[PDB]
Design a protein around this ligand. Sequence first.
Ligand SMILES: NC(=O)C1=CN([C@@H]2O[C@H](COP(=O)(O)OP(=O)(O)OC[C@H]3O[C@@H](n4cnc5c(N)ncnc54)[C@H](O)[C@@H]3O)[C@@H](O)[C@H]2O)C=CC1
Ligand SMILES: NC(=O)C1=CN([C@@H]2O[C@H](COP(=O)(O)OP(=O)(O)OC[C@H]3O[C@@H](n4cnc5c(N)ncnc54)[C@H](O)[C@@H]3O)[C@@H](O)[C@H]2O)C=CC1
Ligand SMILES: N[C@@H](CN[C@@H](CCC(=O)O)C(=O)O)C(=O)O
Ligand SMILES: N[C@@H](CN[C@@H](CCC(=O)O)C(=O)O)C(=O)O
Ligand SMILES: [Cl-]
Ligand SMILES: [Cl-]
Lengths: 310, 310
Amino acid sequence: REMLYLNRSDIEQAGGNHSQVYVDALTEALTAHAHNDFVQPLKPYLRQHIADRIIAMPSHIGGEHAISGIKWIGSKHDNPSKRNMERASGVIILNDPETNYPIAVMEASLISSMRTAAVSVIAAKHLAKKGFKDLTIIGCGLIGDKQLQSMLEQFDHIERVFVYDQFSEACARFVDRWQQQRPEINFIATENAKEAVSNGEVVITCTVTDQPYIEYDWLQKGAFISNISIMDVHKEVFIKADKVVVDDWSQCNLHAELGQLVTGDIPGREDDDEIILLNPMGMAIEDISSAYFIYQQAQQQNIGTTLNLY
Amino acid sequence: REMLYLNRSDIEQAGGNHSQVYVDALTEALTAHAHNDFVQPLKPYLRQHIADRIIAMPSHIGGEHAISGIKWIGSKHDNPSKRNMERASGVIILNDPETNYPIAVMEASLISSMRTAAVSVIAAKHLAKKGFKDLTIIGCGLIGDKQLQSMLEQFDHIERVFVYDQFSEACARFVDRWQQQRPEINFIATENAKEAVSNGEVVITCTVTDQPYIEYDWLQKGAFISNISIMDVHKEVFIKADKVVVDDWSQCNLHAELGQLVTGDIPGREDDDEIILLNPMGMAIEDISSAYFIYQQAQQQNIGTTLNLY
Ligand SMILES: NC(=O)C1=CN([C@@H]2O[C@H](COP(=O)(O)OP(=O)(O)OC[C@H]3O[C@@H](n4cnc5c(N)ncnc54)[C@H](O)[C@@H]3O)[C@@H](O)[C@H]2O)C=CC1
Ligand SMILES: NC(=O)C1=CN([C@@H]2O[C@H](COP(=O)(O)OP(=O)(O)OC[C@H]3O[C@@H](n4cnc5c(N)ncnc54)[C@H](O)[C@@H]3O)[C@@H](O)[C@H]2O)C=CC1
Ligand SMILES: N[C@@H](CN[C@@H](CCC(=O)O)C(=O)O)C(=O)O
Ligand SMILES: N[C@@H](CN[C@@H](CCC(=O)O)C(=O)O)C(=O)O
Ligand SMILES: [Cl-]
Ligand SMILES: [Cl-]
């Protein structure tokens, strides 16, 4: 009985640091979600602050290439502040549905951040205006960085990126390094959240806030907002938005669930005036499908450390 | 960021194949449970049969040597039958409560079976008659084997062991091999469950049944029964038993919870006529405390494979 171990470096080497593999994996997974060919229990929170927890996210995906597993992801808001460590960390375990035996142990933080960015990309394909040019990011942390990276990889027509962080220094670092990575694009450090949001055709919230600040009349007409960090958006926006989209309804306790957009069962953006809001809680099937996708490529390229179970 | 990997062989080498380390670990853990110095969410079942599932069991134990983690344990009743693999398998992850980062990845099946046997031993210390000589095991699988091993290690006064399995061949193998391990003890293969149970001062159920068969008037007066497999015991026994003990009440949806027996807050057996029933659902704090105990000894004896997280 063997298990393939894949650290973050191995995952990158297997192609886990580019958005396309996650877009591909989620596309098939979200299709499976719409066809209800999955099992996804409620995720229990282990708290001993909102960003101080470890969440167990188990799921099963059906099919001929059926896969099971869990994401065991921890978090401490203090980690970057007081320890110079990433806030989130954890492992992903994959399981053979035939025996339920574990077949893979994989680092989770990179996969988690990249699938989350892929959620925004996929939603933008259906909900954002065609050829949108202004992107807005709030929160210059790990998640926000991968959000920006993925959107740039997937949308070549992006010309300006408006960035804001409550911590001015965090925003300054973020803008400066990305300005070097993409010189032809103007990265604009705003002085408040309102200036950044009101200048964005696509707005992504990547903070750790516990109280909303996003007001409805900030949003441009035709704007699409991927509410990744959930708590950033005022209730009025949920009411005044032309279309509200979630990833999984029962999990969020309505225009559509994200899976129905990819299957064409429910249309996405229908005009360039619609203000569309995405509220994705994050699903375990996203982590498991992404992990199983990467794990297979690693096996192909002989990447990873083989462990014995017994 | 490093993680110590410990397979089943490493766990044995670190002393994970003797009951005493589990009795020690649970004793402190059950003490912590009684003092409510723990966090233990409800465990979600992942089903895609009763023994066909994967269970996420996360918990946190407080203190100066506080520890967090999860047991991700899968099961397939078909595994021994059609594949010659153990029914249960899985991994245990340990986490540093300060950062919630993972610090250990450990095989779970051995630890799981041994802590479960330690639950029976500890309960027997309080609920079984002093110097009991007749032990009864129903179910000759992996769990039942470790149940027998641990009881023999902890109770030298055991003279006879009555064994039964619905599958006659399973019972025959079990009895024969254990008769060679302990020749001075009479291992008696019974022809029905009733004969085995009615001859036991301590009765342990280790099957995978879904319907009760244990009747009240089978039980001797003074008997103690550790209902490990849960479903073996008829409802009448719960009513007619002099004392009913569980491991965790809220988890089982009453004389005492097991933790209160170890703290002396509630007495155990008070006379040798009391028929006492233990109904242990199994707690994550049992797996996590046992794992953290073993993990520490492995670090001392330089046992295990060091992995990099990034
Ligand atoms: N929906 C999903 O599936 C996922 C959601 N999330 C969420 O994304 C966030 C994680 O971000 P990370 O980069 O990993 O952690 P992080 O701590 O490294 O990033 C936080 C950054 O946002 C900034 N920020 C905080 N609060 C703010 C505010 N009120 N206003 C404006 N700007 C602000 C902070 O200064 C910090 O720079 C968490 O809230 C997490 O819950 C995380 C992963 C996936
Ligand atoms: N309370 C706790 O914390 C724990 C409870 N359990 C339970 O212990 C059982 C696992 O046993 P394993 O040895 O690991 O699996 P196993 O499949 O290897 O053992 C099953 C054995 O019991 C026999 N058996 C089944 N049904 C029966 C019946 N109606 N009557 C009489 N005899 C019978 C089977 O023939 C088989 O030999 C499961 O029911 C599991 O849920 C397992 C682990 C810890
Ligand atoms: N929206 C959820 C976050 N759930 C995320 C957790 C990922 C992480 O903590 O880095 C996930 O889906 O994995 C929340 O606010 O608690
Ligand atoms: N009593 C529970 C069993 N819970 C066990 C699972 C362990 C295993 O499946 O080997 C555990 O506590 O780990 C049930 O009947 O579902
Ligand atoms: Cl916490
Ligand atoms: Cl299953």
